[PDB]
Amino acid sequence: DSFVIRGNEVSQIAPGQTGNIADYNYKLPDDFTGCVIAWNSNKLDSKVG
């Protein structure tokens, strides 16, 4: 699964953790299994303005 989030919400993608990126957007289970990968991309997803 792939998507883009702010830089203070990256933590929200975790088993059973509350916030604003895993409360109403999308949340994974507490018995989740796998891995997660994130990398700040500000040269192709951030424009001036």
Partner 1 sequence: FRPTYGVGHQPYRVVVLSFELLHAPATVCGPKKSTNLVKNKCVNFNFNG
Partner 2 sequence: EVRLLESGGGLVQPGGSLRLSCAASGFTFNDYAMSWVRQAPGEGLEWVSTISYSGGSTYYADSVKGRFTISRDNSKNMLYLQMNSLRAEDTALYYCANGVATADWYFDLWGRGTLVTVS
Which positions lie near partner 2, rule CB under 8 A?
43-44, 47-49
Nearest residue (CB) to partner 2, 4 versus 35: 4
Burial of 19 (C-beta count, 10 Å sphere; 0-12/13-18/19+): middle
CA distance 14 to 29: 8
Q: Give the contact letters, 16-45, x = binds to partner 1 (CB under 8 A), - = no.
A: ------------x---xxxxxxxxxxx--x
Asked if residues 28 and 35 have their Cβ atoms less than 8 Å apart, the reply is: no
Q: Which residues bind partner 1 (CB under 8 A)?
A: 1-8, 10, 13, 28, 32-42, 45-49
